Design an enzyme around this catalytic site. Sequence first.
Site, mmCIF file in Angstrom:
data_model
loop_
_atom_site.group_PDB
_atom_site.id
_atom_site.type_symbol
_atom_site.label_atom_id
_atom_site.label_comp_id
_atom_site.label_asym_id
_atom_site.label_seq_id
_atom_site.Cartn_x
_atom_site.Cartn_y
_atom_site.Cartn_z
ATOM 1 N N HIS A 25 37.779 34.954 -18.671
ATOM 2 C CA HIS A 25 39.340 33.499 -18.870
ATOM 3 C C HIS A 25 39.696 33.875 -20.727
ATOM 4 O O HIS A 25 41.240 34.367 -20.716
ATOM 5 C CB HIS A 25 38.711 32.447 -18.444
ATOM 6 C CG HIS A 25 39.170 31.495 -18.096
ATOM 7 N ND1 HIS A 25 40.691 31.603 -17.679
ATOM 8 C CD2 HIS A 25 39.465 30.148 -19.040
ATOM 9 C CE1 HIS A 25 41.177 30.851 -17.602
ATOM 10 N NE2 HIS A 25 41.136 30.076 -18.973
ATOM 11 N N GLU A 49 32.929 23.312 -16.104
ATOM 12 C CA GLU A 49 33.141 22.393 -14.814
ATOM 13 C C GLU A 49 32.457 20.635 -14.634
ATOM 14 O O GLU A 49 32.951 20.170 -14.805
ATOM 15 C CB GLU A 49 32.994 23.385 -13.980
ATOM 16 C CG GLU A 49 33.870 23.204 -12.310
ATOM 17 C CD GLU A 49 35.534 22.753 -12.707
ATOM 18 O OE1 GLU A 49 35.944 22.323 -12.328
ATOM 19 O OE2 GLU A 49 36.224 22.917 -13.562
ATOM 20 N N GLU A 97 30.551 27.068 -14.387
ATOM 21 C CA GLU A 97 32.109 27.488 -14.460
ATOM 22 C C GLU A 97 33.335 27.655 -16.018
ATOM 23 O O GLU A 97 33.696 26.358 -15.974
ATOM 24 C CB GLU A 97 33.013 27.326 -13.300
ATOM 25 C CG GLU A 97 34.692 26.912 -13.813
ATOM 26 C CD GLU A 97 35.101 26.753 -12.789
ATOM 27 O OE1 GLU A 97 36.012 25.861 -11.676
ATOM 28 O OE2 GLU A 97 34.852 27.920 -12.105
ATOM 29 N N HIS A 120 35.486 27.498 -18.934
ATOM 30 C CA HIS A 120 37.029 27.679 -19.427
ATOM 31 C C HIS A 120 37.111 28.132 -20.678
ATOM 32 O O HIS A 120 36.869 29.054 -21.198
ATOM 33 C CB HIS A 120 37.150 25.933 -18.592
ATOM 34 C CG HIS A 120 37.255 26.337 -17.361
ATOM 35 N ND1 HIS A 120 36.877 24.856 -16.766
ATOM 36 C CD2 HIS A 120 37.823 27.127 -15.888
ATOM 37 C CE1 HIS A 120 36.150 25.739 -15.495
ATOM 38 N NE2 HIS A 120 37.175 26.012 -15.078
#
Length: 293
Positions: free
Chosen positions: A227, A283, A267, A269
């Site tokens: 990401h 997350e 998760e 980011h």
Amino acid sequence: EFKLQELNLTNQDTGPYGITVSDKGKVWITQHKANMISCINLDGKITEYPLPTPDAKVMCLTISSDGEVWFTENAANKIGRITKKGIIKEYTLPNPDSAPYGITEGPNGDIWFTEMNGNRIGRITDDGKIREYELPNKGSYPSFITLGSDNALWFTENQNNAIGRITESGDITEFKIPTPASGPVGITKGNDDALWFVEIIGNKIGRITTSGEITEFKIPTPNARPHAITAGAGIDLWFTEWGANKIGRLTSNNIIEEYPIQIKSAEPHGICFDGETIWFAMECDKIGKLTLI
Ligand SMILES: [Cl-]
């Protein structure tokens, strides 16, 4: 090997997403579910700044050279700014449902941003004036944006499978990625003076020189779903693998190493490096702090 610490944030399931760090050492994070921006200082004082516009889907942020925080309100069609006085101004985008996303400072000190659904690159001044540059192909989905060593802005076109360059005069050049339908997302400037990006579908890290020359590197874990990407020390790059719950590192003979995050549905980011420490948003209402050696 590597050391990981965590910072707890948690007013509830706040959706930590974008992250940056001041040269003061302050970390700033956006929180898209809680509809707020939080900062934590090294002594642990936390300030939560509720956004004035409800359900704004705050996504990305940056710290300008003059110290203010600028951010995108993806669902509210706005660019925000937190001034040195701790007050939040928003500026509404000229066309509706533009979906601002990525955000960065340009060479003359304006703030430049991508409009995901508007299919434009935006530009805003100190005094709130907005200028925009339409992309040539419809449905390009411009995503992350960064300042390149050429003093042009470079951004990913997630659904046109290209890297774009835009100069201060508005001249756009698009370089098509050689991995078909690769889904570029994060992009950043490397200390080698090329731009480095991630391909979420491709499962690759890419490198593009400021002349447009593209090379790619396969990520070892399949379905890593990278990401964001940031420069490290030297020629290191660091990236988040949302899909695999790892932190990736490109070091060096262009080897990709991976460091699995000891924890659950992290998760990861956003990601930022401050000279010693890799910071990333996670997350589950946490920020990760990673260090080698
Ligand atoms: Cl500028």
